[PDB]
Amino acid sequence: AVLPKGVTQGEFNKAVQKFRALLGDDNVLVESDQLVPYNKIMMPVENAAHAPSAAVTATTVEQVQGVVKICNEHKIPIWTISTGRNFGYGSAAPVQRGQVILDLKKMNKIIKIDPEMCYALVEPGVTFGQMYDYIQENNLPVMLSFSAPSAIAGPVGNTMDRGVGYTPYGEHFMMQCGMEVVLANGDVYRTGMGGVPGSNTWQIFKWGYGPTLDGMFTQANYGICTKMGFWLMPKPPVFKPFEVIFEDEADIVEIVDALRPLRMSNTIPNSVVIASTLWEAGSAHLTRAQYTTEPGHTPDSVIKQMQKDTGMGAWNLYAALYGTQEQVDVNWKIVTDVFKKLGKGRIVTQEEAGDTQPFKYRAQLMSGVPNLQEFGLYNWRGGGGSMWFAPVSEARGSECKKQAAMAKRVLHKYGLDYVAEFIVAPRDMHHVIDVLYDRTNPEETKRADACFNELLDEFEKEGYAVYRVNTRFQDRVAQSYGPVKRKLEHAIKRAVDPNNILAPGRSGIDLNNDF
Amino acid sequence: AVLPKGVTQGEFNKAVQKFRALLGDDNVLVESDQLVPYNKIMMPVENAAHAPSAAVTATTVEQVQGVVKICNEHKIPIWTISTGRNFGYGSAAPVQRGQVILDLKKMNKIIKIDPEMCYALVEPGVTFGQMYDYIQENNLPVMLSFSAPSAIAGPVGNTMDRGVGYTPYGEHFMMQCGMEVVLANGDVYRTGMGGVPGSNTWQIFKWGYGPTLDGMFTQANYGICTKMGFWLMPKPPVFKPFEVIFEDEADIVEIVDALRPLRMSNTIPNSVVIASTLWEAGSAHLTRAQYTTEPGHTPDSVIKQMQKDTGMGAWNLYAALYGTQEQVDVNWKIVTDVFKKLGKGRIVTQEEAGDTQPFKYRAQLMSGVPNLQEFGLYNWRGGGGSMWFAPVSEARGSECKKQAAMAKRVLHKYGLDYVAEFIVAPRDMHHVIDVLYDRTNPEETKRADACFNELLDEFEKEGYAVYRVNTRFQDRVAQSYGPVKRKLEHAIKRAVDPNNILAPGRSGIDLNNDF
Amino acid sequence: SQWGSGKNLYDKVCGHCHKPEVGVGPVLEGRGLPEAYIKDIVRNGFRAMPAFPASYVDDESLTQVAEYLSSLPAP
Amino acid sequence: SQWGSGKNLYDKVCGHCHKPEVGVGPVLEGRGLPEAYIKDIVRNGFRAMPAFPASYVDDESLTQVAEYLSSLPAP
């Protein structure tokens, strides 16, 4: 008995009949059992708060255009998902209870993969697993970049939320080129060179002419992406993954400051990772229950012990070199020299780490080989509770240390652990913190909800904001960036979606707001 | 006696009085002699077609806010310029006759240059010459990237038009991070992390949260940029510029196909250039009059002769390596191996080239050292006539050859020369063609205007469009990208500038249009 | 078929977490798990395990993977 | 002063085109060019040469560069 906000059963019924006429009964889901899989969430709130009123699956641009026409006629708000694996950010459920889910998972054609110009053009339902298989079967000399969910996640969905990967092409939005969206009025708009008839540069040159709008659509509700292109890294002759293990929490300062110049000069070209002890442990499949059942956060003494028994450090750095054997050798000398001069850090090579975890899954992610090893993080405490708190930071040692201490303090206040890693770009850090809790425990769930709120508050007080967040907090995070920004975002919303049918609430953009 | 379109002398007078009250008499220019310098254009049309009605100079954000308030009150259209050196694209003159020029040249503070995080935050009037001096005086270990006008041009203005440079940071918009704009309603909007109170990551992380809008403002008239941040390349230990000279026009195919992999793998990291014989000649300061006064285009026999007498080739490639001596050596071996295997191309090193031109100015541009050597292009035929015809192309040999032949055919039809170069990215080419003519010659000027029109038509027929264009053709080029795009652009325009006061006509965006 | 076979669905999706050598999820091979249970867990999701809509993994593929897994020897 | 001195304006702007070793524009050093002519050329621009608004190069700076150039020996 879930209906869209402000939509009567009568109007909803008319829209459903039209969706059926347009898409066919098998593509219109209104029964509770058909909707339950879309409702699965890891956020500290009951399923009902994000329950969809229905879901429709489209496979063509024309069907998507038909859907928005019906949505405008009956004021039906729709929440678009591609592969829908947005775990820790709301998964496949709508931002507001009652929205109809426009599920594009079946619109899964790989339109093109050019092995010479090195790019791909795909539909929303395409998964990285699907692309990996296609590239291997066809022996194409290119590689992918992807989030840990890799195999089951997809490039369109991940890029629309500006997700990240672990190869030199890890800044996904940065490597995206060309996008097609169906606007609320049904128009099909192509960014960049896509609007030029007969164009062959849609996946070649990003900007096009006049305002370049790809960014305006990411993390927004101004259109429905139906095609997206992106650049692919040519497969290099040599790939050399490596790890550097540090023993003290305080080393993060010197680690980051020594790493920055290496990233800045591109000597280490990929999005490096500096994983804390508990992230390392969770990724290696150790669970808290194996070391303690004491209430509250995991005692620093249990962590120091874990390090002692496993060899994991307070910080575990994973990076890689790419190129010809000669380029790799020259760069390896530079890297090893930096760490030797630092006087800290145990370097671990592939020959040494061998087939062990977590080195293996790290090396695979850094080379575009899919695996879901990191889902071990959800077994640290289990119960299905997980929210990503991901503040942005300068890639400066002191900043990273300050944020770690702040987060740790707030997490402990609520009986939770500091489970984190710094995803390193030349100048910035995606400081990723997995707020893990047992969602089957009501009391702990309330603590996780309050904890997330406090992390946002405390970080904002120090001038820090997150780059992406789950649906329960998208309005709260929008507040972090100021009223002028929100006002402009609502003016654009009014202009491209006067009826407020496209995922109202996405990033705090909703015409029902007083902006 | 120039007035803004649709603005009466009475309303213009009220606005001027308010501009005077706000900015001071010395900052409001209405006399013909004060305006003539802004009217200097290289487009094939009389000055009157782009004559401004006035110019106002602001030095603060508050003054810019005051200017838009007055503009909204009296419906005064304003054309914003920063350093105004947009030669070949309309220079400092407004896109439509009668607009008031908002000249931000005096708003020239270098707000910040961080030598560790390697970035700069500047105001519109800041020039690259100013920044170069600052960097050298303070011995900062960073380098700049800039268009050939370098010393007199500036990062804000160049980036607002998505211009390019010749170092690994040559894709200026790509390296831009954080932007501040005054919206038509007077609101001051900061992109990315700028809206977060107490934020220190405005020039650190590009996207921010929610829609990322920097692109929306570039090549657009949705706001007035008052501050812009961008990343700076750390000064490497070794810089190795080099050139490869090719003898035949047809070599462009093998040149581009051999080069692509090197750019794609980043072995050659900078925006390489492949200059045609006449571009090379003009940059080396040779003039057509030195070889012939025969009417029409410069005869292929005169060009083959020029090559014979100077050593210049049909194609002259300039590139560079950066890093430690070891990195440079490893990559130099790879590059020289590629060309030796190609069996074509004479490699010229800095030691051989010496202090000779054009090698010297190329080496300087590729290392962020300013010079205006390339303005020799305007002496090829002289007379002040020059328009950039810059189609985008796949960095594929066959495509580049096809475009060169198409351009040459149209240019020759009108008695003009193929003076061009390919600015090489890993996958795209900014195919830059300087349409040079004697603007003091009425007949030749008419031919140049017809020629540019035909170049756009002919390239459009093959699915090619330009990435940027002079003010006389901005509406024509907007047509190349289709009606859906233009409609979306006008909806956004209506939403952020209901009174149509911000540079109407920029990129074909004008509320007077039927879109 | 959406996945062609139960073995292919297992290799491309389920196995990335459930294969013995991975250990993210419990071993399902040769466990005699009923088809009804597999469909239930997949459609509803289960604590740390995500749910998959029919658009991602349809009923027929679930029938196939259930039979495939049951046919394997217990690791 | 906007440029401090005529020599600095010449070094930072005009010279990038006019210095003998560059050759983009004609030699101006020691040519006895009148200040009135220099201001006219700079304000109006001249064929291949761009124009410069007073916001970029003010009258005082033009007076200084005129005097500076006239004081130099002819190359």
Ligand SMILES: *Cc1cc2c(cc1C)nc1c(=O)[nH]c(=O)nc-1n2C[C@H](O)[C@H](O)[C@H](O)COP(=O)(O)OP(=O)(O)OC[C@H]1O[C@@H](n2cnc3c(N)ncnc32)[C@H](O)[C@@H]1O
């Ligand atoms: C559980 C987990 C998750 C995870 C991770 C590690 C673990 C153990 N590591 C991540 C990482 O390295 N990098 C990263 O970016 N994310 C990481 N995650 C979180 C997540 O699971 C992935 O990000 C996943 O790739 C996101 O899921 P998916 O790729 O399937 O994308 P989606 O759910 O379909 O879309 C995400 C959001 O984008 C907007 N959306 C999607 N489609 C559209 C279209 N077509 N048009 C407009 N907007 C669209 C929605 O807001 C959607 O929710």
Ligand SMILES: *Cc1cc2c(cc1C)nc1c(=O)[nH]c(=O)nc-1n2C[C@H](O)[C@H](O)[C@H](O)COP(=O)(O)OP(=O)(O)OC[C@H]1O[C@@H](n2cnc3c(N)ncnc32)[C@H](O)[C@@H]1O
């Ligand atoms: C003559 C010449 C020109 C040239 C070149 C070689 C020669 C011999 N080589 C170029 C190159 O290598 N790369 C490139 O990008 N351009 C090249 N050019 C053309 C040009 O001269 C330069 O691009 C120059 O850098 C552009 O001039 P400038 O940098 O001074 O920028 P501008 O005129 O101030 O602004 C350009 C346009 O942007 C918009 N505008 C400017 N400021 C604002 C603000 N503050 N807010 C909103 N929009 C703004 C206007 O449309 C403006 O006209």
Ligand code: HEM
């Ligand atoms: C692939 C579509 C798939 C199937 C099928 C599947 C089944 C499944 C079952 C039947 C269980 C319960 C097992 C039991 O009772 O012993 C179960 C449990 C978990 N799963 Fe699963 N699963 C499939 C896929 C995946 C994927 C892709 C992942 C990893 C992201 C995953 C993970 C898990 C986890 C963790 C559990 C344990 C949950 C708990 O006990 O808390 N599954 N799965």
Ligand code: HEM
């Ligand atoms: C710097 C503000 C500056 C001054 C001063 C200046 C002066 C100047 C004069 C007086 C002439 C005419 C000389 C004569 O008649 O013999 C002249 C001519 C040209 N200039 Fe100039 N100039 C200044 C700056 C610049 C700059 C920065 C450039 C290069 C972009 C430049 C170029 C030229 C050119 C070319 C000419 C000759 C034009 C023609 O005959 O077509 N000037 N300048």
Ligand SMILES: [Cl-]
């Ligand atoms: Cl979630």
Ligand SMILES: [Cl-]
């Ligand atoms: Cl011009």
